[PDB]
Amino acid sequence: MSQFMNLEGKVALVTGASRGIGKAIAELLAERGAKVIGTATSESGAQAISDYLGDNGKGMALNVTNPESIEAVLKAITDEFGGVDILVNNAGITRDNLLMRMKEEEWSDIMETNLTSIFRLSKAVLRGMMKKRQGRIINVGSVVGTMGNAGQANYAAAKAGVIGFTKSMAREVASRGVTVNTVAPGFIETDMTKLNDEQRTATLAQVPAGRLGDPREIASAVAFLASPEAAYITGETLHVNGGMYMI
Amino acid sequence: SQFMNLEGKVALVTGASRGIGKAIAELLAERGAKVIGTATSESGAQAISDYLGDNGKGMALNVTNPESIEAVLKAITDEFGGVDILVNNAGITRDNLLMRMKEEEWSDIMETNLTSIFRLSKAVLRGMMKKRQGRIINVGSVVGTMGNAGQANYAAAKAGVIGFTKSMAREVASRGVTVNTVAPGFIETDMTKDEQRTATLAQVPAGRLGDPREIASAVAFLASPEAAYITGETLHVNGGMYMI
Amino acid sequence: MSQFMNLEGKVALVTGASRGIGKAIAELLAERGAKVIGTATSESGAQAISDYLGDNGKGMALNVTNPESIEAVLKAITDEFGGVDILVNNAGITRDNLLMRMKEEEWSDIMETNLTSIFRLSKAVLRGMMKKRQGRIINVGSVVGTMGNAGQANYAAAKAGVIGFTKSMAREVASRGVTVNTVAPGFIETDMTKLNDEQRTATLAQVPAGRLGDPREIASAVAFLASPEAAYITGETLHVNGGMYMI
Amino acid sequence: SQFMNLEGKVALVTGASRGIGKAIAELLAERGAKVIGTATSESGAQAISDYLGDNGKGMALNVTNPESIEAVLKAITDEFGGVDILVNNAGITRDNLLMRMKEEEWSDIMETNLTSIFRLSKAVLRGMMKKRQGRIINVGSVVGTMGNAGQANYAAAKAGVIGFTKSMAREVASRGVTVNTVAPGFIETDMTKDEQRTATLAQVPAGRLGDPREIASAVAFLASPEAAYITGETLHVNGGMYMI
Ligand SMILES: NC(=O)c1ccc[n+]([C@@H]2O[C@H](COP(=O)([O-])OP(=O)(O)OC[C@H]3O[C@@H](n4cnc5c(N)ncnc54)[C@H](OP(=O)(O)O)[C@@H]3O)[C@@H](O)[C@H]2O)c1
Ligand SMILES: NC(=O)c1ccc[n+]([C@@H]2O[C@H](COP(=O)([O-])OP(=O)(O)OC[C@H]3O[C@@H](n4cnc5c(N)ncnc54)[C@H](OP(=O)(O)O)[C@@H]3O)[C@@H](O)[C@H]2O)c1
Ligand SMILES: NC(=O)c1ccc[n+]([C@@H]2O[C@H](COP(=O)([O-])OP(=O)(O)OC[C@H]3O[C@@H](n4cnc5c(N)ncnc54)[C@H](OP(=O)(O)O)[C@@H]3O)[C@@H](O)[C@H]2O)c1
Ligand SMILES: NC(=O)c1ccc[n+]([C@@H]2O[C@H](COP(=O)([O-])OP(=O)(O)OC[C@H]3O[C@@H](n4cnc5c(N)ncnc54)[C@H](OP(=O)(O)O)[C@@H]3O)[C@@H](O)[C@H]2O)c1
């Protein structure tokens, strides 16, 4: 209702919003007033997004590794809603393996999807933001980017790369009222995590909080950084991990 | 709404007569907390009571005085019950290059900016642990992470705050208490009140000083139910002056 | 002469050793007893390396973006010298631009050369190291990876990615006596830096030491991490930047 | 050889009677430094004189006593000239969960592990600055960066050490003095002397405790001419226990 953390008038683009964290981000940004565009890799996924967003946004099909798709989706957004004010780079995948078993494809698929996508999507929205002297870019990273993790050298390289990209863009655009930050979740209750008894208990053994995080808790950190009130935060990595790692 | 709603929470914000501390106390009150803010003099305490009105009150407190801390906490507990949110904002500077830095300038900083947080955190923790819910939020400084010439004492204390924070976060996370630090960059306050500002501003990509309200916002965020999965963190609010 | 920081018996592979930092690394490792293989992108570069290394190693032509070249060079090394004990991933490039001017090629060339190369080269030497329960992997990163820098979002993403990769591999192989670390130089006196009066004075204005670093100073940090004495260091980033940035 | 050669340097290593401090003093001597190591008792000082032989000597020092520090520094300066390398190794632990942590357990840690570094660094800095060459190397702890339950006091001090380090590095870098921290993980010493070690080891990827010589090596490296471009750094030597 109030003027606090109020995103009325802002257009938000949330990639990979069909479920879990991306869905929670999209839902919360809309609740705080934003016109939200959520993306999925298929039209039926896009349609499921439209359905949960109702009058507060819509779903669009997007492949973040395809520049043609990116250009199509942003043109469509800008026509109806105007320039994107808030970009949330949530889309991402895992292709886990110990290094000696890791395929070239498994490395390159992670680079493309989890790191190079952020370069393309960010580049695609930045001009409009610089022109208006207002913007938010928020990348959904991971505790693994900062901590490292066995069996996820590719994922960790890509997520650490997102931080290096963020800090640099932060410096490039700070004087023009655009912030660029990363939110780094620890282990969050999701389809991915819903693992056998042993594995969950093992990861949980490394969380002081003694539980998995909720997608809503990641959404909240993203909504915070997206807000007018977070204008003096840039180049930051906001860790939301239950104490799994502390920097 | 239910979002970032602190209704039912009792907040203690030290050093709340002006600047960052006042912005924190005001915002926590606006989000529904019952707020007790402190100053070092009774007329300061009164001015806090005055701006809080029915949302809380002002008390006189010296954070380097065990008997003051104990008296203020008994007062708060008697009237409002135990503290749910602790904001350690009170802090000073005693700037000097090391070769000119007096024993008392080192020690005043250790006592006021670091030991105070040990004493106050200890004083509120048992209640938060029994309740299985709590927030301790320390107001650090970019200087704690970046260092700054002429502020080795201040940097030592503010870095120490983070080591303390990480340790306590580990100690109490399983009992639903979070411990975090908000690290302001250069914010327009009395502490920062032409060539010296231009020099500071030259190191801030944002090209401006931060507002006290912007620090308040970070503190309110971490104080919220929604920030329950954040602990042992240092949240930098510095316009890009430093990036970790 | 002594048993201190003694690399006698170790085989070192230093990529991009024809000049500057890579050359200084190669020269120092040889001085400390290592059999050193330095690489360049051409046979004449390789030959210049052979010439400075003399009886303590040789030059080889290597393209770190070509798996065929990598497999050829390691097979050649292993035949003559045995398994690589020390890998120094120094080869790298810059393709600077502000994001809005940055080409797809400029991004992908940096990813390939500065990040994906480390995946390939590391994967190529790790088995032998794990088998012997002894190894060093040392990546030459950059202060930019941790600090960010305007006009170098690609470079910074790749160099930050190297840290995420390092931490993960460090966890994967620590129990098998292999360390994996990064050395992150600040601004070092090199061909790259030998910039106009204004630009050098500008970068120097951000260095408390008030000078550029020497390539030998980077070589020393690498030699330190390569040593038996540094066995309890892994997953670390060793900053050698004159106080430009402090973590 | 000329490599990592400390001939002509005077090194002061506090807390050098055993463990890490002794490994540091021995290695600095082996690399050619004239070494003065300290213990808290004269028989400790004598044992240091005994293992150093002609490479240096042992002195009694309490790093929480200004008059002791001043006496030891005058002794060193009279005989050997001013200190070129300062190694702040002396440190203690006073473990307890916060609710059981006494005032004296907080303060002994602040005085012994943090304020001592202010006093000793201040005592040697003018000489290093005039000479335009110097090394101050603090022995921190992984706990300063990682935190640890039951060690909030120790973590606060060891984190504080790093804030101090970054500030002084900035202050004196232009005059050729470096200030750094080596942060040991769990090292086999008296301080760490079955289930408790297994629990510690379980968090170390290397699957072993560090050796005191491995910390000595890091200290010798940073003490060297070759490390002149390293300042304001924290060098972690922890077997992968933590990775920054
Ligand atoms: N799960 C965790 O515990 C955790 C922890 C830390 C960080 N994260 C990070 O948080 C983000 C979201 O995580 P999550 O676990 O909620 O993901 P998720 O439930 O697996 O969903 C992934 C989303 O990304 C989209 N996506 C995948 N590839 C794409 C592509 N090439 N182009 C466009 N979209 C694509 C998917 O689209 P479709 O719906 O069409 O498949 C989907 O909407 C990721 O960046 C992940 O790395 C997750
Ligand atoms: N401003 C900045 O640029 C900046 C940057 C980074 C961090 N910070 C941190 O932010 C916090 C507040 O900063 P500020 O700039 O708002 O400071 P400020 O304007 O000087 O206000 C300091 C507050 O602390 C109180 N205080 C001082 N000593 C005390 C003591 N011994 N016991 C109890 N209360 C005491 C003061 O009370 P009285 O009103 O009675 O004096 C006052 O309310 C500090 O911890 C500071 O280190 C500030
Ligand atoms: N210069 C600095 O101030 C500075 C600061 C921080 C970090 N660094 C990093 O330190 C490392 C070395 O820096 P530098 O400035 O000394 O480099 P440099 O003098 O420009 O030389 C680069 C070296 O890398 C090799 N190389 C380039 N592309 C290659 C490829 N595709 N395959 C194989 N080798 C290739 C070059 O081979 P050829 O000889 O055949 O061309 C050359 O030997 C780099 O990773 C750089 O990012 C430099
Ligand atoms: N061991 C570890 O796992 C570990 C890990 C991380 C960091 N560290 C750090 O490494 C340093 C040395 O550790 P350690 O394990 O070798 O400790 P230690 O075996 O307990 O030795 C401590 C040394 O400090 C001296 N000392 C104690 N209090 C002093 C005082 N007030 N004034 C002057 N000297 C004093 C002692 O002298 P006496 O011989 O006279 O008692 C002794 O020589 C400490 O700073 C510690 O915090 C150790």
CSV table of N, CA and C and ligand atoms in Angstrom, one decimal, chain B residues 14-22 24 38-41 44-45 48 60-65 88-93 111-113 116 138-143 154 158 182-192 209 212 215, ligand 2:
chain,number,residue,atom,x,y,z
B,14,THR,N,20.7,1.8,19.2
B,14,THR,CA,21.6,2.7,19.9
B,14,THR,C,22.1,3.8,19.1
B,15,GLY,N,22.2,5.0,19.7
B,15,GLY,CA,22.7,6.2,18.9
B,15,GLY,C,21.7,6.7,17.9
B,16,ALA,N,20.5,6.9,18.4
B,16,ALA,CA,19.4,7.2,17.5
B,16,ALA,C,18.9,8.7,17.6
B,17,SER,N,19.8,9.6,18.0
B,17,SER,CA,19.4,11.0,18.1
B,17,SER,C,19.5,11.7,16.8
B,18,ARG,N,20.3,11.2,15.9
B,18,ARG,CA,20.5,11.9,14.6
B,18,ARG,C,21.1,10.9,13.6
B,19,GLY,N,21.2,11.4,12.4
B,19,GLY,CA,21.8,10.7,11.3
B,19,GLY,C,21.2,9.3,11.1
B,20,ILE,N,22.2,8.4,10.8
B,20,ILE,CA,21.8,7.0,10.4
B,20,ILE,C,20.9,6.3,11.5
B,21,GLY,N,21.3,6.5,12.8
B,21,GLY,CA,20.5,5.9,13.9
B,21,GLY,C,19.1,6.4,13.9
B,22,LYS,N,18.9,7.7,13.7
B,22,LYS,CA,17.5,8.2,13.7
B,22,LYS,C,16.7,7.7,12.5
B,24,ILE,N,17.1,4.8,11.0
B,24,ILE,CA,16.9,3.5,11.4
B,24,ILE,C,15.6,3.4,12.3
B,38,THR,N,18.4,5.4,21.7
B,38,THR,CA,19.2,5.9,22.7
B,38,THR,C,20.1,7.1,22.3
B,39,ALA,N,20.4,8.0,23.2
B,39,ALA,CA,21.3,9.0,23.1
B,39,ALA,C,22.2,9.0,24.3
B,40,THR,N,23.2,9.9,24.4
B,40,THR,CA,24.1,9.9,25.5
B,40,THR,C,23.7,10.9,26.6
B,41,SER,N,22.7,11.7,26.3
B,41,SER,CA,22.2,12.7,27.3
B,41,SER,C,20.7,12.6,27.3
B,44,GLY,N,18.9,14.4,24.6
B,44,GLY,CA,18.9,13.5,23.5
B,44,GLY,C,17.8,12.4,23.5
B,45,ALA,N,17.7,11.7,24.7
B,45,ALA,CA,16.7,10.7,24.9
B,45,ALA,C,15.3,11.3,24.7
B,48,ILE,N,14.4,11.8,21.1
B,48,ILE,CA,14.0,10.5,20.5
B,48,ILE,C,12.6,10.2,20.9
B,60,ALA,N,18.5,7.3,27.8
B,60,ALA,CA,19.9,7.7,27.8
B,60,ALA,C,20.8,6.4,28.0
B,61,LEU,N,21.8,6.3,27.3
B,61,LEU,CA,22.7,5.1,27.3
B,61,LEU,C,24.1,5.4,26.9
B,62,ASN,N,25.1,4.9,27.7
B,62,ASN,CA,26.5,4.9,27.3
B,62,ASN,C,26.9,3.5,27.1
B,63,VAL,N,27.2,3.1,25.8
B,63,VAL,CA,27.4,1.7,25.5
B,63,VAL,C,28.7,1.2,26.0
B,64,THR,N,29.5,2.0,26.6
B,64,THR,CA,30.8,1.6,27.3
B,64,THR,C,30.6,1.5,28.8
B,65,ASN,N,29.4,1.5,29.3
B,65,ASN,CA,29.1,1.4,30.7
B,65,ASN,C,28.1,0.3,31.0
B,88,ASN,N,23.0,-2.2,16.7
B,88,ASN,CA,24.2,-1.6,17.3
B,88,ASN,C,24.6,-0.5,16.3
B,89,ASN,N,24.1,0.7,16.5
B,89,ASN,CA,24.5,1.8,15.6
B,89,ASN,C,25.5,2.8,16.3
B,90,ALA,N,25.5,3.0,17.6
B,90,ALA,CA,26.4,3.9,18.3
B,90,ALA,C,27.8,3.6,17.9
B,91,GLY,N,28.5,4.7,17.6
B,91,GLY,CA,29.9,4.5,17.2
B,91,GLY,C,30.6,5.9,17.0
B,92,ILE,N,31.9,5.9,17.1
B,92,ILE,CA,32.6,7.2,17.0
B,92,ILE,C,33.9,7.0,16.1
B,93,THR,N,34.5,8.1,15.8
B,93,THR,CA,35.8,8.1,15.1
B,93,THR,C,36.8,8.9,16.0
B,111,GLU,N,36.5,0.4,22.7
B,111,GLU,CA,35.4,0.3,23.7
B,111,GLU,C,34.0,0.7,23.1
B,112,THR,N,34.0,1.7,22.3
B,112,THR,CA,32.8,2.3,21.8
B,112,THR,C,32.3,1.6,20.6
B,113,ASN,N,33.2,1.1,19.7
B,113,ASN,CA,32.8,0.5,18.4
B,113,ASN,C,32.8,-1.0,18.4
B,116,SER,N,31.4,-2.7,22.9
B,116,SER,CA,30.0,-2.4,23.2
B,116,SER,C,29.1,-3.4,22.5
B,138,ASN,N,24.5,-5.1,13.2
B,138,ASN,CA,25.5,-4.1,13.5
B,138,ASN,C,25.7,-3.1,12.4
B,139,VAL,N,25.9,-1.9,12.8
B,139,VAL,CA,26.3,-0.9,11.7
B,139,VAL,C,27.8,-0.8,11.7
B,140,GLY,N,28.4,-1.4,10.6
B,140,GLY,CA,29.8,-1.4,10.4
B,140,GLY,C,30.2,-0.1,9.6
B,141,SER,N,31.1,-0.4,8.7
B,141,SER,CA,31.6,0.7,7.8
B,141,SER,C,32.4,0.0,6.6
B,142,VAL,N,32.3,0.6,5.4
B,142,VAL,CA,33.1,0.2,4.3
B,142,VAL,C,34.6,0.2,4.7
B,143,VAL,N,35.0,1.1,5.6
B,143,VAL,CA,36.4,1.2,6.2
B,143,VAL,C,36.9,-0.1,6.8
B,154,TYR,N,39.5,2.8,13.9
B,154,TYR,CA,38.2,2.6,13.4
B,154,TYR,C,38.0,1.3,12.5
B,158,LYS,N,35.7,-1.9,13.3
B,158,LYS,CA,34.6,-2.3,12.3
B,158,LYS,C,34.9,-3.6,11.6
B,182,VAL,N,25.5,-4.3,8.4
B,182,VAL,CA,25.3,-3.4,7.3
B,182,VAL,C,26.5,-2.4,7.3
B,183,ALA,N,27.3,-2.4,6.2
B,183,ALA,CA,28.5,-1.5,6.1
B,183,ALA,C,28.2,-0.3,5.2
B,184,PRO,N,27.9,0.8,5.8
B,184,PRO,CA,27.7,2.1,5.0
B,184,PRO,C,29.0,2.5,4.3
B,185,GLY,N,28.9,3.1,3.1
B,185,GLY,CA,29.9,3.9,2.6
B,185,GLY,C,29.9,5.3,3.2
B,186,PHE,N,30.2,6.3,2.4
B,186,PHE,CA,30.2,7.7,3.0
B,186,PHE,C,28.7,8.2,2.9
B,187,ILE,N,28.2,8.5,4.0
B,187,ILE,CA,26.8,8.9,4.1
B,187,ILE,C,26.7,10.3,4.7
B,188,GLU,N,25.8,11.2,4.2
B,188,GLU,CA,25.7,12.5,4.7
B,188,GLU,C,25.2,12.5,6.1
B,189,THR,N,26.1,12.7,7.1
B,189,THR,CA,25.8,12.9,8.5
B,189,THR,C,26.7,13.9,9.2
B,190,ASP,N,26.5,14.1,10.5
B,190,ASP,CA,27.4,14.9,11.3
B,190,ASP,C,28.8,14.4,11.3
B,191,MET,N,29.0,13.1,11.3
B,191,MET,CA,30.3,12.5,11.2
B,191,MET,C,31.1,12.9,9.9
B,192,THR,N,30.3,13.1,8.8
B,192,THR,CA,30.9,13.5,7.5
B,192,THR,C,30.6,15.0,7.2
B,209,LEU,N,27.0,11.1,-2.1
B,209,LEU,CA,27.0,10.5,-0.8
B,209,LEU,C,25.7,9.7,-0.6
B,212,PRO,N,21.0,8.8,4.8
B,212,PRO,CA,20.8,7.9,6.0
B,212,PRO,C,19.6,7.0,5.8
B,215,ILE,N,20.6,3.6,4.4
B,215,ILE,CA,21.1,2.7,5.4
B,215,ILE,C,20.0,2.1,6.2
E,2,LIG,N1,28.3,8.8,8.4
E,2,LIG,C1,29.1,7.9,7.8
E,2,LIG,O1,29.7,8.3,6.7
E,2,LIG,C2,29.3,6.5,8.3
E,2,LIG,C3,29.9,5.7,7.4
E,2,LIG,C4,30.2,4.3,7.8
E,2,LIG,C5,29.7,3.9,9.1
E,2,LIG,N2,29.1,4.8,9.9
E,2,LIG,C6,28.7,4.2,11.2
E,2,LIG,O2,27.3,4.5,11.4
E,2,LIG,C7,27.0,4.6,12.8
E,2,LIG,C8,26.4,6.0,13.1
E,2,LIG,O3,27.1,6.9,12.3
E,2,LIG,P1,26.7,8.5,12.3
E,2,LIG,O4,27.5,9.0,11.1
E,2,LIG,O5,25.2,8.6,12.2
E,2,LIG,O6,27.2,9.0,13.7
E,2,LIG,P2,26.8,10.4,14.5
E,2,LIG,O7,26.0,11.3,13.6
E,2,LIG,O8,28.1,10.8,15.2
E,2,LIG,O9,25.9,9.7,15.6
E,2,LIG,C9,26.4,8.8,16.6
E,2,LIG,C10,25.4,8.3,17.5
E,2,LIG,O10,26.0,7.4,18.5
E,2,LIG,C11,25.8,7.9,19.8
E,2,LIG,N3,26.9,7.6,20.7
E,2,LIG,C12,28.2,8.1,20.5
E,2,LIG,N4,28.9,7.6,21.5
E,2,LIG,C13,28.1,6.8,22.3
E,2,LIG,C14,28.3,6.1,23.5
E,2,LIG,N5,29.5,6.0,24.1
E,2,LIG,N6,27.3,5.4,24.0
E,2,LIG,C15,26.0,5.5,23.4
E,2,LIG,N7,25.8,6.2,22.3
E,2,LIG,C16,26.8,6.9,21.8
E,2,LIG,C17,25.5,9.4,19.6
E,2,LIG,O11,24.7,9.9,20.7
E,2,LIG,P3,24.7,11.5,21.0
E,2,LIG,O12,23.7,12.0,20.1
E,2,LIG,O13,24.3,11.5,22.5
E,2,LIG,O14,26.1,12.0,20.8
E,2,LIG,C18,24.7,9.4,18.3
E,2,LIG,O15,23.3,9.2,18.6
E,2,LIG,C19,28.4,4.6,13.5
E,2,LIG,O16,28.6,3.2,14.0
E,2,LIG,C20,29.4,4.8,12.4
E,2,LIG,O17,30.7,4.2,12.7
E,2,LIG,C21,28.9,6.1,9.5
